[PDB]
Amino acid sequence: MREIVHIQAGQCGNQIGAKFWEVISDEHGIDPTGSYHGDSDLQLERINVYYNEATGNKYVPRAILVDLEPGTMDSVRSGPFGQIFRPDNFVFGQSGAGNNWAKGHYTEGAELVDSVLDVVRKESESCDCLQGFQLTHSLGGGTGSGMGTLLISKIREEYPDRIMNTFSVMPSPKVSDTVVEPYNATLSVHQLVENTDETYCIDNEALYDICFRTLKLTTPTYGDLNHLVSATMSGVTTCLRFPGQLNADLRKLAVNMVPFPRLHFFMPGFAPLLTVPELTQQMFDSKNMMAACDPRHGRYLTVAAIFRGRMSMKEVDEQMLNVQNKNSSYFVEWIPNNVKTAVCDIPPRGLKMSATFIGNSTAIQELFKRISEQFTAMFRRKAFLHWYTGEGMDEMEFTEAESNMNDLVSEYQQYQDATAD
Amino acid sequence: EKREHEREVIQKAIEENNNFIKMAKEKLAQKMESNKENREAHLAAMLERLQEKDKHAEEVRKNKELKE
Amino acid sequence: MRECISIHVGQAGVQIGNACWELYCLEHGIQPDGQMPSDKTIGGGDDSFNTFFSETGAGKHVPRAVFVDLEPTVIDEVRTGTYRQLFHPEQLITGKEDAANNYARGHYTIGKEIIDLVLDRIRKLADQCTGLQGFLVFHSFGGGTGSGFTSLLMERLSVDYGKKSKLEFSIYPAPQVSTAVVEPYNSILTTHTTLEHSDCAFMVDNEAIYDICRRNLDIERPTYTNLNRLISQIVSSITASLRFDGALNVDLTEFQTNLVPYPRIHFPLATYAPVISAEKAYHEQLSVAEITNACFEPANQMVKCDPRHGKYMACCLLYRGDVVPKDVNAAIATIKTKRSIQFVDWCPTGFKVGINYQPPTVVPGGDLAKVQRAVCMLSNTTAIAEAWARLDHKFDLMYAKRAFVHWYVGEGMEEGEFSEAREDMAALEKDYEEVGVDSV
């Protein structure tokens, strides 16, 4: 058994975290009571990775639900599977965060952190072999962005030798109006670059655009968006959850995916939103990327591809070889055999064949450039600095988080320009 | 003379089988020791900066108490 | 006596041990519970098969083997599989956390926690030996256990057993079945750390094995089960001299005299024939002269390289089954005139032949045809250095940007170990050049 420990934080965090468990519970054969009503035993073989086994053969997610406002909390139990969770693993503020990063990181979040850290430990010490953690949150406002990165700091301090995997949801002015988001994100990324091993960028700008153009949704809801995220998140964990050729775990992912510690921000992808070549074409298509970045504008350091369904893997092998040949200038040449693939026989609910695509592309600097720009439009103005310097923060701290995120893009460019000869 | 030689050759084969077990044993212990210090030195660096982060969260909270 | 202990390290090593030990059992008539009706010497003996199998008083024949892996997935399947009764629990050793594809974790971080226990278990196997010959170590180049734990165990075995023989069966990485993008790093690190501690190493190129499977057995996307069942045939042939008696049978160690002209030049090229499906082997008997000939077709080699564009330092033929010296001699004579076989100028050009009469065996439901006669050629050719060249090039592409190098430094290793390893490899490739140059 290799136990991941899940942590949802904030408004965005808990919601995308919730449909996550709804989906993987359905794939694995678990109803909202925690019992297994499933056909195949391939759904149990590695169930302990996300699930505590309770006698009465009840499987309990290994989830720590967290927020600074009890509202988001109540929704969870009320919703489907709300009663599969552990009642103790809810940890709730009262005063809330009010879309302020300082309130999540330094002040009000500080007051609730040690109450989370305690549930972490209780869950961590129950583990035969703790992989680490995945945090579902947002970088746009309040609890998930700030307390989530303060919780990261604190956890890494107690588990410096465990993996820290986050699903961070990046702000898009096409989906939220609160103007302090370019601030919240940049201060989070300053922390994410320094204290996570793997961060999947879920870009609300790319989730919107997808829903609006491909899915043609004239007004997409945070529920139509989160339908995309649940598909992605079931995908980028297939090899954690199901038996396969490769004994995937959160560190083997990191070792093989992250050639430089800081360059650990993955562009996810899904298809379809079919044949093995259409999948592959779409899966490498910038229209299927969950981060508003075009791969053809940079170069792939490393790529992972999950094929789900019943399909000729001989076909898959030739198809994946085909895209690297025809697209060869878009994979850095100084890292051989840097595109791996895995196939799992069970596809997600309602798709006979899916593909999921994790990429580490220097084009992610696009994502970070858009945030960097909206930042400086406010920071050049000194706008709303009072929401932050009032909570005790220095102005130097905005400068630093800004220079750091600028370096991160500068380093992506360094290796996009790098050659072998 | 020939027997003096015969015993010198078997003394050499022993000398060298031994020096080889020796230098292996030592090369190992050197490596295993330089590795504990390196890995520790690295884990220590990580904590020292994770805690200097906690000191900065004191300074930050103590500034908002200089607001009231 | 002359007993050999086999050590199977990591997923590749363990799974290949399953293929080899299931094959040995079928060869020697041993059943999955360990009983052998033909052994009338209960509790012991010095029969040839006893070089690989001890006997319990209750009649069980028990592999002189140890399976070590830093996680339990792969060895749990041995503990519960068809042959679970064959092994004593204490032969099957597992950790809780594997090496995560990292040489450092296999050698230092995770491995240092189980090495004493593994050495201890090995000592209990050697203490049952009246004349221990050596060890046979099976491991991948690519995995973090395969590379870093193997080499830790190799250094250790050298300390506890001095110059006693250590042979390697090493899985050389191939892009079609590879696990990790860092397989070149683990590859060079372990090749450097082990080079002093190994007397003979047979490399198996996963792409060589993969192509033979696709091409001679018509398997579309061959699995580890497909490849392992072919590797164990080649392993079987190399060890059949140890496990079997025979007038015309020649000890492996005698072939090693010929195969290693200098300590570092110890990587023999294996080639095996016939690899042939049942349908294509039906009505088509392949003669001594046909299989011998196949040995000199580069597409039948365990490692991809061109012996034609290199030089031979030794060439051995290990036959099993229906083969007699007259035929062998006829076949070699034709090949010498019709094939490109240049020897270096400092070593004789005769072929060294051994014949085991017991015919080859196949495993229920396998893809290999049961043939009347088989052969494994073991050559020491400079061409093998090509495999070093390729692998050394992949290492360089990455190390020049220090890609991934932080995953090793954070586990305690220094960049200097990397350049030291690659220099050793640079020298090895230069040694293989030097042996081939003519004399003055």
Ligand SMILES: Nc1nc2c(ncn2[C@@H]2O[C@H](COP(=O)(O)OP(=O)(O)OP(=O)(O)O)[C@@H](O)[C@H]2O)c(=O)[nH]1
């Ligand atoms: N021929 C063959 N090769 C294998 C097999 N299993 C793994 N390999 C090869 O081994 C290489 C990776 O090393 P592994 O043995 O799988 O890893 P490990 O030894 O368990 O070490 P860890 O990284 O700690 O898991 C890959 O390149 C594979 O090609 C097998 O069953 N047969």
Ligand SMILES: Nc1nc2c(ncn2[C@@H]2O[C@H](COP(=O)(O)OP(=O)(O)O)[C@@H](O)[C@H]2O)c(=O)[nH]1
């Ligand atoms: N994709 C997606 N984004 C969300 C969702 N809920 C909130 N967000 C984003 O998160 C940001 C607000 O942070 P929030 O979740 O309210 O923090 P909290 O109130 O402390 O939990 C906004 O910019 C939203 O775009 C959701 O359900 N789906």
Ligand SMILES: COc1ccc2c(c1)NC(=O)CN2c1nc(Cl)nc2ccc(F)cc12
């Ligand atoms: C090519 O570079 C690699 C990228 C990724 C990986 C890897 C090598 N090798 C490993 O053993 C872990 N691993 C993966 N890990 C996880 Cl969690 N999911 C995956 C899904 C698909 C897939 F192809 C690989 C993985």
Ligand SMILES: [Ca+2]
């Ligand atoms: Ca006997």
Ligand SMILES: [Mg+2]
């Ligand atoms: Mg393993």
